[PDB]
Coordinates of C-alpha atoms and ligand atoms in Angstrom, one line a residue:
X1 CA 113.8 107.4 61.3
X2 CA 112.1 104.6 62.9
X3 CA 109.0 106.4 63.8
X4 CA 105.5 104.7 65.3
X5 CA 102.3 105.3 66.3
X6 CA 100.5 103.0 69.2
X7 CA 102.3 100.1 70.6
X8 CA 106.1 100.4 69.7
X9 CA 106.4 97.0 69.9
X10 CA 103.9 96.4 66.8
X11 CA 105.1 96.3 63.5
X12 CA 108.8 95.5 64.4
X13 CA 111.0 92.6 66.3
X14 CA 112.9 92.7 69.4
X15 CA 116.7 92.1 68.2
X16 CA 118.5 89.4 70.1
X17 CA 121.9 90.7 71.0
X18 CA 124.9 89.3 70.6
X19 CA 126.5 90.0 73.9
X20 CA 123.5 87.3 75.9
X21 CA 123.9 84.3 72.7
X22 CA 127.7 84.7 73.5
X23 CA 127.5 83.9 77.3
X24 CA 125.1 80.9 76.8
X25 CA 126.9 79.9 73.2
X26 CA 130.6 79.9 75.1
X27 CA 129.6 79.9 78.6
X28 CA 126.8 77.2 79.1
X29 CA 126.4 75.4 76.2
X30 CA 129.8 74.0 76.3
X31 CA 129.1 72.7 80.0
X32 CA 125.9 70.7 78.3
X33 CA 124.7 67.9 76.5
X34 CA 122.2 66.4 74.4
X35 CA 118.8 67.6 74.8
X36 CA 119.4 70.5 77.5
X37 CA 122.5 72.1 75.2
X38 CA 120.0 72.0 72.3
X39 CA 117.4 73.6 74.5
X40 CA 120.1 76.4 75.8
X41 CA 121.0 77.2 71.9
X42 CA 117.0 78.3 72.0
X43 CA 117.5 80.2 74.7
X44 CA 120.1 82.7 72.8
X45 CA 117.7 83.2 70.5
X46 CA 114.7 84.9 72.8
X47 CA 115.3 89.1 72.6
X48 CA 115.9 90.7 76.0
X49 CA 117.4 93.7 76.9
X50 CA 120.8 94.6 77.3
X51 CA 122.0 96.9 80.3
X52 CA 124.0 100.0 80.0
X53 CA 124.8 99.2 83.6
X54 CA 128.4 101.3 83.2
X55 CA 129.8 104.2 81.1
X56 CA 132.1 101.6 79.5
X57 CA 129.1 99.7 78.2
X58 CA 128.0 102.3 75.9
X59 CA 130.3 101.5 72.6
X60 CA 128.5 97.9 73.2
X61 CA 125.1 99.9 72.7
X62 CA 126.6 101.0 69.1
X63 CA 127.8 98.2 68.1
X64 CA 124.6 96.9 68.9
X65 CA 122.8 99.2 66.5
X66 CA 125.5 98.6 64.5
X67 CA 124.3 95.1 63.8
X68 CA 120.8 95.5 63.6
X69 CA 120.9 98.1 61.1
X70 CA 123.1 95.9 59.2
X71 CA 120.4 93.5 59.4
X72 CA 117.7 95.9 58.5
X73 CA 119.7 96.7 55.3
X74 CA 118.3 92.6 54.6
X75 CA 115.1 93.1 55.8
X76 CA 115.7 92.2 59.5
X77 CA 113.5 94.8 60.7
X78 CA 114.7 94.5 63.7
X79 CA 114.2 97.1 66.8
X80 CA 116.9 97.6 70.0
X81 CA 116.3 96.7 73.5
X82 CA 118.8 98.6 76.1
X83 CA 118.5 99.7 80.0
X84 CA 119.3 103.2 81.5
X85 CA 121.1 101.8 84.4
X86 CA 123.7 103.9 86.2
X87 CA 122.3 106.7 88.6
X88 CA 124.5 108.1 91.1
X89 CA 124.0 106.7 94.9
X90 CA 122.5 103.6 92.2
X91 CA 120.3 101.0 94.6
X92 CA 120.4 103.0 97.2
X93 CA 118.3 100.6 99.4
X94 CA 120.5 97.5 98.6
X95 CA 122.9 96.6 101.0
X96 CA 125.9 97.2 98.6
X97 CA 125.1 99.3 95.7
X98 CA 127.6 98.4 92.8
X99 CA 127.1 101.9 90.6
X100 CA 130.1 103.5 89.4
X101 CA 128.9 106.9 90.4
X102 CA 128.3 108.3 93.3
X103 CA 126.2 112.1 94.2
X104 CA 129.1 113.2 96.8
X105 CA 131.6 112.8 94.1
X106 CA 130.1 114.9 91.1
X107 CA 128.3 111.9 90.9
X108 CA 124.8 113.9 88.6
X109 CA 127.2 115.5 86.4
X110 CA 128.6 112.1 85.2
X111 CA 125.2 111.1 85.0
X112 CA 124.0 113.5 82.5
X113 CA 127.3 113.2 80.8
X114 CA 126.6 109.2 80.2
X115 CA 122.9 110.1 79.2
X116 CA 124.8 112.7 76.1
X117 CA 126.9 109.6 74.9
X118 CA 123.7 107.6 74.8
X119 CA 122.2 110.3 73.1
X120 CA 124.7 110.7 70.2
X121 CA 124.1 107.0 69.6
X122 CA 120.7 107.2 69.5
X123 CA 120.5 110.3 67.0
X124 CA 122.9 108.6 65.0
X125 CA 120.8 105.7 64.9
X126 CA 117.6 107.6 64.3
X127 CA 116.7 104.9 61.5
X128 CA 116.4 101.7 64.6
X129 CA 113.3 101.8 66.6
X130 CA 115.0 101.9 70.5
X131 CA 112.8 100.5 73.3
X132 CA 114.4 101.4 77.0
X133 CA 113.6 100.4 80.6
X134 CA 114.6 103.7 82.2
X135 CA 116.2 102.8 85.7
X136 CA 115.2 100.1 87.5
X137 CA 115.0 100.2 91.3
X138 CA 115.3 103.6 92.0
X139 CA 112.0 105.6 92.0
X140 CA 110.5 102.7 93.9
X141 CA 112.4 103.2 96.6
X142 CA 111.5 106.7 96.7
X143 CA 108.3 105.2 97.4
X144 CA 108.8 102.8 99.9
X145 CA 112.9 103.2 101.5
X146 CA 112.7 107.0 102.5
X147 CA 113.5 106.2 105.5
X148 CA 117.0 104.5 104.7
X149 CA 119.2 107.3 104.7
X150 CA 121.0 106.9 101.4
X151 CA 117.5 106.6 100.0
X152 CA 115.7 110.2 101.6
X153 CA 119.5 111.7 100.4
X154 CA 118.9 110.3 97.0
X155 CA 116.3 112.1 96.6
X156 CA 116.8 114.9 94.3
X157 CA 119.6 113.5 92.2
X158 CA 117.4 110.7 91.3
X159 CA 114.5 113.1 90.1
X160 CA 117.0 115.6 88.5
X161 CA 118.9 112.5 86.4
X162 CA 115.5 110.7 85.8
X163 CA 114.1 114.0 84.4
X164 CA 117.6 114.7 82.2
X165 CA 117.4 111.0 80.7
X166 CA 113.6 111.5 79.8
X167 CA 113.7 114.7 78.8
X168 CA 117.4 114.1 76.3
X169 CA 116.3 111.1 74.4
X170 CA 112.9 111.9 74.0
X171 CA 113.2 111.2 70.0
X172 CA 110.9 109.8 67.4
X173 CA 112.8 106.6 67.2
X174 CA 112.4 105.6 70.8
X175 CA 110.3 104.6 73.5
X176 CA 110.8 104.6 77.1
X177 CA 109.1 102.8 80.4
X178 CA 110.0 103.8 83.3
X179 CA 110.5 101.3 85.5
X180 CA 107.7 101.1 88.5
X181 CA 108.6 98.1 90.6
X182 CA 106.1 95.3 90.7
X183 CA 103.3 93.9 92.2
X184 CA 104.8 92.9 95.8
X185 CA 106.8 96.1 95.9
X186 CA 104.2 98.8 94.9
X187 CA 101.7 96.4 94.1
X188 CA 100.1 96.9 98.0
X189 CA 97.3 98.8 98.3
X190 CA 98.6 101.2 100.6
X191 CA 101.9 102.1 98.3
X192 CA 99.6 102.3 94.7
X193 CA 98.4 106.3 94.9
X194 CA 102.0 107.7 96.1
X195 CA 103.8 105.5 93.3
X196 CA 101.1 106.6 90.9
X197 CA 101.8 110.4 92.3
X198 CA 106.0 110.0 91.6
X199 CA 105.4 108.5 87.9
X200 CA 102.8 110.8 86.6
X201 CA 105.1 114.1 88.4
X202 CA 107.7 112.5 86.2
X203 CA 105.8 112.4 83.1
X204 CA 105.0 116.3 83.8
X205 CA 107.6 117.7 84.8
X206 CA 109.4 116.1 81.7
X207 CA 106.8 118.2 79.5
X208 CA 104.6 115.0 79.3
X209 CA 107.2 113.1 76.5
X210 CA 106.2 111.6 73.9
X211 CA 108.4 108.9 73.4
X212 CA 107.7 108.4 77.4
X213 CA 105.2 105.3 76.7
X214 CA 104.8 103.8 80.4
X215 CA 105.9 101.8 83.3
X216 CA 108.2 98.5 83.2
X217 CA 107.2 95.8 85.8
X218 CA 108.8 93.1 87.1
X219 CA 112.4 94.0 85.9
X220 CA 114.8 91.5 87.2
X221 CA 111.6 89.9 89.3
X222 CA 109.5 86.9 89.7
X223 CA 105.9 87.6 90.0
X224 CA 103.6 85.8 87.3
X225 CA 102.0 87.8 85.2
X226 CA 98.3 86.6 85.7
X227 CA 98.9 83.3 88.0
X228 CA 95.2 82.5 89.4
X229 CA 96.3 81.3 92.6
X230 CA 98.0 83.9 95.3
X231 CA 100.7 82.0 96.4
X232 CA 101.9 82.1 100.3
X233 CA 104.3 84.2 99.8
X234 CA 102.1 87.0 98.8
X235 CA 100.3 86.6 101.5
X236 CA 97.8 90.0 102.8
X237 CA 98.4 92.3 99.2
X238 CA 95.2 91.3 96.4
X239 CA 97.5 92.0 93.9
X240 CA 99.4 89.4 93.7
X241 CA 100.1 89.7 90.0
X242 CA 101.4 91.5 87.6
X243 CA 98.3 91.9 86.0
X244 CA 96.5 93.0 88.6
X245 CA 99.2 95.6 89.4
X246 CA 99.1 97.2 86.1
X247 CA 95.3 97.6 86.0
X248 CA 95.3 99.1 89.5
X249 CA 98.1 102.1 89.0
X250 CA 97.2 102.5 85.6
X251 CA 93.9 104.2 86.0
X252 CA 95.2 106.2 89.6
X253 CA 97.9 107.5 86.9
X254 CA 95.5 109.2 84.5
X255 CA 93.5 110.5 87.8
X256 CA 96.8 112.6 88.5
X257 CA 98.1 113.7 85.1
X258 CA 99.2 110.7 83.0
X259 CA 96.7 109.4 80.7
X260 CA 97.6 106.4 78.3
X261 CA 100.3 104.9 79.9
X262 CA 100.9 101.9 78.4
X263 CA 103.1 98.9 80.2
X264 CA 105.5 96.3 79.3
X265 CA 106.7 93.7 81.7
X266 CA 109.6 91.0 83.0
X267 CA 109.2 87.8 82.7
X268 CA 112.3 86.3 82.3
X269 CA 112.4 83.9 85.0
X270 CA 108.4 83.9 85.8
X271 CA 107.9 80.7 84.3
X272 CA 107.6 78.8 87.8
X273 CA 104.9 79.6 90.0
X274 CA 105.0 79.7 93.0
X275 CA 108.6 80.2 93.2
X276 CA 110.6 79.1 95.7
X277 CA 110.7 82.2 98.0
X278 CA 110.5 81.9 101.5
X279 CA 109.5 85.7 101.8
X280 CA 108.4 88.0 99.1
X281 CA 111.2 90.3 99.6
X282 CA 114.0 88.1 98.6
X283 CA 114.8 89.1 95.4
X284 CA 119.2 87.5 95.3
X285 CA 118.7 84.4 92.7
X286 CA 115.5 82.9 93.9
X287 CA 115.5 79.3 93.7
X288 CA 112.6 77.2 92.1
X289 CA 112.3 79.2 88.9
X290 CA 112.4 79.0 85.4
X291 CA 112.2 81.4 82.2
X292 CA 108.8 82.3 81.4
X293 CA 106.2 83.5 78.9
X294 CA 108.2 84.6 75.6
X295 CA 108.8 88.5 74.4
X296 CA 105.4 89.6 72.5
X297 CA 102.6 92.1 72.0
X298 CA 100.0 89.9 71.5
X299 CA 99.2 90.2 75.5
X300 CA 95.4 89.9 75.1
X301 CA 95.4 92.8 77.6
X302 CA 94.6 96.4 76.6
X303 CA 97.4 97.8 79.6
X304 CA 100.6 95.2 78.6
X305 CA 102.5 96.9 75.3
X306 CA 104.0 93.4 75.9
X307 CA 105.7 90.7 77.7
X308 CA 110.0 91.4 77.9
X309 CA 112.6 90.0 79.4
X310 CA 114.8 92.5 81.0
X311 CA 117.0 90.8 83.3
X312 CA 119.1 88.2 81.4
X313 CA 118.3 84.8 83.1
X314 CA 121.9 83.7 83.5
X315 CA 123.3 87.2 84.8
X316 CA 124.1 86.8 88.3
X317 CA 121.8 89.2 90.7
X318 CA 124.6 89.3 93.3
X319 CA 127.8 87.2 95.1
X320 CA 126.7 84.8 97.8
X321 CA 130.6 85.4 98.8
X322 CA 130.4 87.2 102.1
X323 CA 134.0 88.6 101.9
X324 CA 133.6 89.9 98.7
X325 CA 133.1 93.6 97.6
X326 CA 129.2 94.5 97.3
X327 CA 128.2 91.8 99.2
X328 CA 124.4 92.0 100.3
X329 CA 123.0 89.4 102.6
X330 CA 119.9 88.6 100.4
X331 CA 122.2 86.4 98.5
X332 CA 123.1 84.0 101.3
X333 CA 119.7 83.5 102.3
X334 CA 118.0 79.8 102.6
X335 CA 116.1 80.4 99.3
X336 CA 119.2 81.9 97.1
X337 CA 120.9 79.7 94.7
X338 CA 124.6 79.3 95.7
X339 CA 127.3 79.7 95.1
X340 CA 126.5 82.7 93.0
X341 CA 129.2 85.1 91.5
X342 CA 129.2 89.1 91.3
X343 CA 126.2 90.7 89.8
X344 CA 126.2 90.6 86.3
X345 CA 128.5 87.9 85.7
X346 CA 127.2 84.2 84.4
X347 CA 126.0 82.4 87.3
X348 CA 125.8 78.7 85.2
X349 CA 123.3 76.5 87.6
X350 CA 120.9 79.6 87.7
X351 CA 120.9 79.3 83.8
X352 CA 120.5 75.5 83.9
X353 CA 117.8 76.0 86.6
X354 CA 115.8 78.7 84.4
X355 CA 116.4 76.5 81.4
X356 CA 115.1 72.8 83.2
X357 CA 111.7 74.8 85.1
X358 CA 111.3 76.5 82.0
X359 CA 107.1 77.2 80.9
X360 CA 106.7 77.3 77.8
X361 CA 109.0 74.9 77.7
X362 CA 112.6 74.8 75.7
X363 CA 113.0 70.9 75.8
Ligands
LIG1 C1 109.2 93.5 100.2 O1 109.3 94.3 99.1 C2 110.6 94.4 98.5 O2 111.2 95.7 98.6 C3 112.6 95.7 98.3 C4 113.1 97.1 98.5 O3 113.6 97.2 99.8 C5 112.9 95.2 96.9 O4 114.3 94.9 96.8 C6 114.9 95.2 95.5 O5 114.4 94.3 94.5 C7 115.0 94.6 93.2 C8 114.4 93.6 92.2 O6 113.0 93.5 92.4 C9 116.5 94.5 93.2 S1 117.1 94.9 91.6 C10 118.6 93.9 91.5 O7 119.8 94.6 91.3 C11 120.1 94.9 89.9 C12 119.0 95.9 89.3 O8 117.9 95.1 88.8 C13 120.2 93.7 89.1 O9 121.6 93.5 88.8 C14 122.1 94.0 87.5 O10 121.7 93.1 86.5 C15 122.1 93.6 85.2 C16 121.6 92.6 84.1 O11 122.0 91.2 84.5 C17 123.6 93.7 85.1 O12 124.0 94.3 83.8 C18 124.1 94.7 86.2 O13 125.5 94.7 86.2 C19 123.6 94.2 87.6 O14 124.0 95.1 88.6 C20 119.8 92.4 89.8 O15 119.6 91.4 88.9 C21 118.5 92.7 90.6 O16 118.1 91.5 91.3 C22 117.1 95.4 94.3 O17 118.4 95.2 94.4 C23 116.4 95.2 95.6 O18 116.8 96.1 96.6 C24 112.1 93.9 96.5 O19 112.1 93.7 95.1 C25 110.6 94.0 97.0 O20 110.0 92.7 96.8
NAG2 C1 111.8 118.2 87.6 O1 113.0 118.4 86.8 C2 114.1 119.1 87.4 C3 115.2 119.3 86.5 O2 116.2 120.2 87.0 C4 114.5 118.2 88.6 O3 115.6 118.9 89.3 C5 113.3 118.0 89.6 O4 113.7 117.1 90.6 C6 112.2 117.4 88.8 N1 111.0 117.3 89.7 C7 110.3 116.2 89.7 C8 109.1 116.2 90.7 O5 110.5 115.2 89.0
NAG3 C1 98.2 84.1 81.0 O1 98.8 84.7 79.9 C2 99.3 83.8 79.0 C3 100.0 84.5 77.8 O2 99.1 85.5 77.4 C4 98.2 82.8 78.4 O3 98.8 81.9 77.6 C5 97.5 82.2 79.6 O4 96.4 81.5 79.1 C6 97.0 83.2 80.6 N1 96.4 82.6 81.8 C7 95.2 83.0 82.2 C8 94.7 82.2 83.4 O5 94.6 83.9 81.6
MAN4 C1 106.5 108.1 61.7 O1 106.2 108.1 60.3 C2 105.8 106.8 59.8 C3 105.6 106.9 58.3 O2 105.5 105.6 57.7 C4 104.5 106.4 60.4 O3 104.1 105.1 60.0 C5 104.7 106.3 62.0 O4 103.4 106.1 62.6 C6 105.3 107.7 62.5 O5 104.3 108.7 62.4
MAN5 C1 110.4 91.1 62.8 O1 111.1 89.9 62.3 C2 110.4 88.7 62.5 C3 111.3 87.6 61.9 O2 112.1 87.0 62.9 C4 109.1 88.7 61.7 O3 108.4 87.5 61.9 C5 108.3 89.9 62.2 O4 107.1 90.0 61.5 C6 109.1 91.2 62.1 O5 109.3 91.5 60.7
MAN6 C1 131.0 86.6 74.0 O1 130.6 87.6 74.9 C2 130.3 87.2 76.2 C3 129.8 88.4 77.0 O2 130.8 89.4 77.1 C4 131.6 86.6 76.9 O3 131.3 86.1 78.1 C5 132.2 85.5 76.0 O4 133.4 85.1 76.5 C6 132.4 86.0 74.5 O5 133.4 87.0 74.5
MAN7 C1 125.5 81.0 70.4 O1 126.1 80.3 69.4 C2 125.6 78.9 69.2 C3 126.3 78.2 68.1 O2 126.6 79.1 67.0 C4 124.1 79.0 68.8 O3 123.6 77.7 68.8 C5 123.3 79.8 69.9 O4 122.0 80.0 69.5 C6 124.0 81.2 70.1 O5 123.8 82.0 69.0
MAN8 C1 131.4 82.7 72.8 O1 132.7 83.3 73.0 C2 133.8 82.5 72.5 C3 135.1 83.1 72.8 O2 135.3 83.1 74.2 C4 133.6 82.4 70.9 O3 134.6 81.6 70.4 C5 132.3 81.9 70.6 O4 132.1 81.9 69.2 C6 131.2 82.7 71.3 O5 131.1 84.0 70.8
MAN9 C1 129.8 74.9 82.5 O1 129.2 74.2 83.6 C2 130.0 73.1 84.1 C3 129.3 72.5 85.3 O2 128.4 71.5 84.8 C4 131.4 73.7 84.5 O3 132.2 72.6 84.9 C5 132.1 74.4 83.4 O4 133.3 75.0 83.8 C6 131.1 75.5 82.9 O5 131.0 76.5 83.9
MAN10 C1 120.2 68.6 70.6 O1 119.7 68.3 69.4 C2 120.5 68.8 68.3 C3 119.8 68.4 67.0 O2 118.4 68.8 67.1 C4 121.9 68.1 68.3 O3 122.7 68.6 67.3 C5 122.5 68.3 69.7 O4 123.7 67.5 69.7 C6 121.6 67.9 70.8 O5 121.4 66.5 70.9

């Protein structure tokens, strides 16, 4: 059993699947050239997570372990990297949710039946270290969206299946963050002591879990982790920064319950700053941005286990096709790369745009 003590990010390295190095390997590199397809076959070498976004994604998750204890066996010492992604009524702010389950239809049962096979995996792979980003946008909109509808009706089922997840692979091999939003979501002021409230109620009513580490930040965002200049965008909220976000809820969390939280967070395509949104609430492939500071612990900052990249720069955020299925308006916006294909799928001049703004650099 990969057990730890302190940072889980310490004393092992972030595996770099497969799945990611074949997209830019067979999808991009074969579109470029010289210096910039060097520079891409970098890329596929920089750890980020891979998303359990559907049921069917699972047997990828073993295979995943698969491989890295495989390279354990030859000293790899190599940890996994995967996201809890498929709540029922999942993105239930977003103008076109594309989860697979939904809470009128049984949708928590299938739930906690996908959290079992995960499970399974993870006992059976009790000897790989597992970091996980538990659910990303979901309890921040709990925060923040309970006045859309699907949101304030989400309610429940989103605590229940958040608790169930915590609660089931709470194991000595892992760690979990759970993700928190960022800095221009519950970054304000205003929004920092309820969010602080939701997490640590999470934390407790899960029997304060161990392998519960923190908060993720950032997750498929933008923000800089400690840019010195607020840029316009920002505009009215002083923490304009990751940083800054962390070090605010952090303390408010041990006031009601949660003491040492730790935090790890996205910075996959922060690496240009300021980007090029027009408002801080478009999120749908933001133009003017490029991947950012590299997966590490040494953060220099007591709060930040360490710096991730959970969204896949490359991975579409959402179609910019306004007859297509799932189709949210965010992507068609002035400031949104397009043409852009479903979520999920390769979206090749967002990779080539993350690759060319790139800080530190790849060329
Ligand atoms: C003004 O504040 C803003 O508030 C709004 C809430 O009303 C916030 O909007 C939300 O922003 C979220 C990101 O910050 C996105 S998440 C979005 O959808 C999913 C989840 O991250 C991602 O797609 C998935 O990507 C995986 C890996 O590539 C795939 O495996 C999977 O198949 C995909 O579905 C996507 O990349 C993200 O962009 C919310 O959708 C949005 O409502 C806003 O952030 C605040 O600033
Ligand atoms: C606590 O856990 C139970 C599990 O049944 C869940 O239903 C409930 O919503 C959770 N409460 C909070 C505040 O997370
Ligand atoms: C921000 O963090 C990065 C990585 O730790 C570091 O290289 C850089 O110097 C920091 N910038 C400032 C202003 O502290
Ligand atoms: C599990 O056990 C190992 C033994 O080496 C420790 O190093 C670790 O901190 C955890 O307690
Ligand atoms: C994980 O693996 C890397 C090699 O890529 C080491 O440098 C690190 O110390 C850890 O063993
Ligand atoms: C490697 O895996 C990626 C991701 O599934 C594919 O896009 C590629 O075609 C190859 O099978
Ligand atoms: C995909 O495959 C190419 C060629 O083997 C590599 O250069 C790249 O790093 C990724 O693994
Ligand atoms: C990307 O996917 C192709 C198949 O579509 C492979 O041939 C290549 O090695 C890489 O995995
Ligand atoms: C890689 O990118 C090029 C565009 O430069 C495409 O033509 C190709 O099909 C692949 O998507
Ligand atoms: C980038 O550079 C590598 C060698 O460093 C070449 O093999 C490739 O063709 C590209 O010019």
């Amino acid at each position: 059993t990969a057990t730890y003590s302190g940072n889980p990010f310490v004393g092992v390295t972030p595996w770099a699947n497969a799945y990611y190095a074949s997209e830019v390997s067979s999808l991009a590199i074969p579109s470029l050239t010289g210096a910039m397809a060097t520079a891409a076959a970098a890329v596929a070498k920089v750890p980020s997570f891979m998303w359990l976004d559907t049921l069917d994604k699972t047997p990828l998750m073993e295979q995943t372990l698969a491989d890295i204890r495989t390279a354990n066996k030859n000293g790899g010492n190599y940890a996994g990297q995967f996201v809890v992604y498929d709540l029922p009524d999942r993105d239930c702010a977003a103008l076109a949710s594309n989860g697979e389950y939904s809470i009128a239809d049984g949708g928590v049962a299938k739930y906690k039946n996908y959290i079992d096979t995960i499970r399974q995996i993870v006992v059976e792979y009790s000897d790989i270290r597992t970091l996980l980003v538990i659910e990303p946008d979901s309890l921040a909109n709990l925060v923040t969206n309970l006045g859309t509808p699907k949101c304030a009706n989400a309610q429940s089922a989103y605590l229940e299946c958040i608790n169930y997840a915590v609660t089931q692979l709470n194991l000595p091999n892992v760690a979990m963050y759970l993700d928190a939003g960022h800095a221009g979501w519950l970054g304000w002021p205003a929004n920092q002591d309820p969010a602080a409230q939701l997490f640590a109620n999470v934390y407790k009513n899960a029997s304060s879990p161990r392998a519960l580490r923190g908060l993720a930040t950032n997750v498929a965002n933008y923000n800089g982790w400690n840019i010195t200049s607020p840029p316009s965008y920002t505009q009215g909220n002083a923490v304009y920064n990751e940083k800054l976000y962390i070090h605010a809820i952090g303390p408010l969390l041990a006031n009601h319950g949660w003491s040492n939280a730790f935090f790890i967070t996205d910075q996959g395509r922060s690496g240009k700053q300021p980007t090029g949104q027009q408002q801080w609430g478009d999120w749908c492939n933001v133009i003017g941005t490029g991947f950012g500071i590299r997966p590490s612990a040494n953060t220099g900052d007591s709060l930040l286990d360490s710096f991730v990249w959970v969204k896949p720069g490359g991975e579409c955020d959402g179609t910019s096709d306004s007859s297509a299925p799932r189709f949210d308006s965010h992507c068609a916006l002035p400031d949104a790369l397009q043409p852009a294909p479903q979520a999920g799928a390769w979206f090749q001049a967002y990779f080539v745009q993350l690759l060319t703004n790139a800080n530190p650099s790849f060329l």
